[PDB]
Design a binder for this molecule. Structure first.
Ligand code: HEM
Ligand code: ANN
Ligand code: CL
Length: 393
């Protein structure tokens, strides 16, 4: 009934160009079986969206990577939000929602925007820059650790720790083995910064620790909730901003439209998230026998969701392989969907919007002028190097 495929969605050849294999996964059927890892797969928008929005059947508390926490010990203590189901998910989620609230975004937006404008101004003085290291990485590193309340020392551990977490969702391949081998110094830094004395007043971390008296979370849960923001709060924003710059460099007609109307900045970033989906995949585990796409999936099975493929599914999107900054992006699953939908999405969108706004106002052309290098990770898509020449407006 359900087709079996030998495609390894965690192989370097797949990461190098995933789009043809994603069509093969979509067109084989609504539900596929991936013999390489003994998991079910869904690559069309409909089933990906359905799975995301049925958390009681497709649970997260047995892990959202390949490993099933009922069979293997997690490599680190489970996230209290990502790797929890309702009802235990619910109140920690509320605390993170309030810490990263619209009111919080309003407090920090002017400073985030000034830092974006300053970065672009600085980059225009140099002309030829690496849009990853010098822009997509440098800008989030210039705002988010300070907004967390982190000290200056040790911040070089943030991106490595985040890449470790993302690689550890994958199967036990070399990317995962090597990440875990190298983990100890990054993990030691991150866990220490999660303690209350180490988070500056008013920042995201301090506000989590201040939220420990309402009956929603306890003081001993605050360090792991800070850990969630330190795990997730940087590298996908980096990849999304780098993707937007890549798209504006590859599709100059869209940079021309963005320049003509800088209010398209927010949707231009949202479209970049759909187009390049910084998080390519997440898993769920079935809690019961379930019918999905005409298939009967037993209890205790891993289901791999292809978010990036769902965001390029022609069953859902017109011209899905075109970058269109005026596209109606609502409903894309680059941030997930449902109760786990990215609690930090307002932070990522704020950073992406104000960076693209600075580019829209200050830059006339973005020309690739060197070899583009891909960054490989079991669950993240992104670039390692993006040499561009920036021409001032
Ligand atoms: C473009 C940037 C980002 C992308 C593409 C992204 C992607 C995602 C996705 C797809 C999920 C759903 C997980 C699931 O369904 O199992 C998620 C959840 C989450 N994200 Fe993000 N994210 C981004 C930025 C951020 C930022 C900036 C933060 C923190 C400031 C963050 C923190 C979290 C957390 C804590 C969760 C777990 C929420 C829950 O389980 O209820 N993310 N993210
Ligand atoms: C990749 O997205 C996430 C989301 C949450 C967490 C976490 O809660 O630690 C890590 C990565
Ligand atoms: Cl850890």
């Amino acid at each position: 009934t359900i087709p079996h495929l030998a495609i390894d969605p965690f192989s370097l050849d797949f990461f190098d160009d995933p789009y043809p294999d994603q069509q093969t996964l979509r067109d084989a059927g609504p539900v596929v079986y991936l013999d390489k890892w003994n998991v079910y797969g869904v690559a069309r928008y409909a089933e990906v969206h359905a799975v995301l929005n049925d958390p009681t059947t497709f649970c997260s508390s047995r892990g959202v990577g390949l490993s099933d926490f009922k069979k293997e010990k997690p490599w680190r203590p489970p996230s209290l939000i990502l790797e929890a189901d309702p009802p235990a998910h619910t109140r920690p989620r509320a605390v993170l929602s309030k810490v990263l609230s619209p009111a919080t975004m309003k407090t920090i937006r002017d400073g985030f925007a000034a830092a974006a404008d300053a970065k672009v101004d600085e980059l225009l003085q140099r002309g030829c820059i690496d849009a990853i290291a010098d822009l997509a990485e440098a800008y989030p590193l210039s705002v988010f650790p300070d907004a967390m309340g982190l000290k200056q020392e040790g911040r070089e551990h943030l991106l490595p720790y985040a890449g470790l977490v993302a690689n550890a969702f994958g199967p036990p391949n070399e990317l995962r083995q090597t990440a875990i081998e190298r983990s100890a110094p990054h993990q030691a830094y991150v866990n220490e910064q999660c303690q209350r004395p180490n988070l500056a007043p008013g920042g995201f971390g301090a506000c989590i620790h201040a939220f420990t008296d309402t009956g929603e979370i306890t003081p001993d849960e605050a360090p792991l909730l800070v850990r969630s923001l330190l795990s997730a709060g940087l590298d996908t924003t980096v990849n999304g901003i780098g993707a937007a710059v890549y798209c504006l460099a590859r599709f100059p007609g869209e940079l021309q439209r963005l320049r003509s109307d800088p209010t398209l900045a927010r949707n231009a970033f949202e479209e970049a998230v759909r187009f390049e989906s910084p998080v390519q995949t997440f898993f769920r585990t079935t809690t019961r026998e379930v019918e999905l796409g005409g298939a009967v999936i037993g209890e205790g099975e891993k289901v791999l969701m292809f978010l990036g493929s769902a965001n390029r599914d022609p069953r859902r999107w017109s011209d899905p392989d075109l970058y269109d900054i005026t596209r109606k992006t609502s409903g894309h699953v680059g941030f997930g969907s449902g109760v786990h939908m990215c609690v930090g999405q307002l932070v990522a969108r704020l950073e992406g919007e104000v960076m693209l706004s600075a580019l829209a106002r200050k830059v006339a052309a973005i020309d690739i002028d060197g070899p583009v290098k891909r960054r490989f990770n079991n669950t993240l898509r992104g670039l390692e190097s993006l040499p561009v020449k920036l021409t001032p407006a």
